[PDB]
C-alpha cells in the first residue's frame, strides 16, 4: 500500500549527485537513482528542493516522504529515521587552494576558516573536533555558498563529500585553482556507511519497496550503466 505519489526531498547543491541545470531541472546520479526506483515501484514521484538541514525535519513532519541527497547512513541518524540499503559510498575530504599547506589536522587548521554544510556529517565532525579546539568552522545553508566563499577567499578550506568536491567542483570551471588538501577523512562514528534513501521509521512498506527497486536496478546492470555517466570508478564501494 504505497502512496500514489512519493515526495522526495533533495539538496540540489551537490553535483554530480543532485544539482540543477541551467533551466532549473534536477540532474545527477541521485536523481537518476530516485527516478529509476520510482519507475520500478510503479509510483509517481515529486522532487522537492530543500536546504540540506531542512530535509530530516521535513521528513519527520511528513512534508516529504523520502530523502535522496547523498544522505549518509549514520548511527546518529538511525536514531531518528530509517534508511534504504546503500545507494553508494561517500567519504569526506578537505579542499583548499592549490599549493596550500593545509591538512585535515587541528595543528594545520587552528584559526583558519573552514566551511561545512549545515546539518551534514562534515559539520558534526568539524564542530566536535575542530570548532571546539579553535578552528573557525563556518556552517552554510548550501554548498554553492561554500564554494563561492572559498573562491572569494573568505574561506581557507572546505570539508564535504570527496566525490562531490572532485566531480562537481575541482573538475569544473569554478574549482581549477583548488585541490584536495590531505587524504580523505574516514571516521566510522561521524561519516556512516555510505548513503541511502532517508525514510520515516514507521514507513516499513515504503522502505521495502525502495529496497526491492534498488536491488532490481543493481541486478540488471542499470546501476552500473547510470553510474558510468558520471564516474570512472566503483562509486558503490563494498
Ligand atoms: N553525505 C554527507 C554530506 C552531504 C549530503 N548531501 C550534501 N552533502 C551527509 O549526509 O551529511
From Swiss-Prot:
Disulfide bond entries:
38-45
Binding of L-lysine, residues: 11, 70, 72, 77, 121
- Residues that hold L-arginine according to the record: 11, 69-70, 72, 77, 121, 161
Localization of this protein = Periplasm
Q: Which GO terms describe its molecular function?
A: amino acid binding
Task: State how changing residue 30 to A affects the protein, per the record.
Answer: Shows a drastic decrease in arginine and histidine binding affinity
Query: Which domain of life does the UniProt lineage start with?
Result: Bacteria
Keywords, A to Z, come to: Amino-acid transport, Disulfide bond, Periplasm, Signal, Transport
Q: Which PANTHER family match?
A: LYSINE_ARGININE_ORNITHINE-BINDING PERIPLASMIC PROTEIN (PTHR35936:SF23), MEMBRANE-BOUND LYTIC MUREIN TRANSGLYCOSYLASE F (PTHR35936)
Function field: Part of the ABC transporter complex HisPMQ-ArgT involved in lysine/arginine/ornithine transport. Binds lysine, arginine and ornithine. Can also bind histidine, with much lower affinity. Stimulates ATPase activity of HisP.
Indicate the quaternary assembly: The complex is composed of two ATP-binding proteins (HisP), two transmembrane proteins (HisM and HisQ) and a solute-binding protein (ArgT).
Read off the domain note. Answer: Has a bi-lobal structure. Contains two globular domains separated by a deep cleft wherein the ligand-binding site is located.
Protein family membership: Belongs to the bacterial solute-binding protein 3 family.
What is the name listed in the Swiss-Prot or TrEMBL entry for this protein?
Lysine/arginine/ornithine-binding periplasmic protein
Amino acid at each position: 500500500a504505497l502512496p500514489q505519489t512519493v515526495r522526495i526531498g533533495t539538496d540540489t547543491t551537490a553535483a554530480p549527485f543532485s544539482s540543477k541545470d541551467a533551466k532549473g531541472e534536477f540532474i545527477g546520479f541521485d536523481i537518476d537513482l530516485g527516478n529509476e526506483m520510482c519507475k520500478r515501484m510503479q509510483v509517481k514521484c515529486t522532487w522537492v528542493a530543500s536546504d540540506f538541514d531542512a530535509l530530516i525535519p521535513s521528513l519527520k513532519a511528513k512534508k516529504i516522504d523520502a530523502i535522496i541527497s547523498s544522505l549518509s547512513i549514520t548511527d546518529k541518524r538511525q536514531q531518528e529515521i530509517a534508511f534504504s540499503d546503500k545507494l553508494y559510498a561517500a567519504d569526506s575530504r578537505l579542499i583548499a587552494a592549490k599549493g596550500s599547506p593545509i591538512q585535515p589536522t587541528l595543528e594545520s587548521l587552528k584559526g583558519k576558516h573552514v566551511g561545512v554544510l549545515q546539518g551534514s556529517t562534515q559539520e558534526a565532525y568539524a564542530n566536535d573536533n575542530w570548532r571546539t579546539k579553535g578552528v573557525d568552522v563556518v556552517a552554510y545553508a548550501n554548498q554553492d555558498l561554500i564554494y563561492s566563499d572559498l573562491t572569494a577567499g573568505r574561506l581557507d578550506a572546505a570539508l564535504q563529500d570527496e566525490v562531490a568536491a572532485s566531480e562537481g567542483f575541482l573538475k569544473q570551471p569554478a574549482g581549477k585553482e583548488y585541490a584536495f588538501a590531505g587524504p580523505s577523512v574516514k571516521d566510522k562514528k561521524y561519516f556512516g556507511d555510505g548513503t541511502g534513501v532517508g525514510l520515516r521509521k514507521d514507513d516499513t512498506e515504503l522502505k521495502a519497496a525502495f529496497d526491492k527497486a534498488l536491488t532490481e536496478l543493481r541486478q540488471d546492470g542499470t546501476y552500473d550503466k547510470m553510474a558510468k555517466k558520471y564516474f570512472d570508478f566503483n562509486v558503490y564501494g563494498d
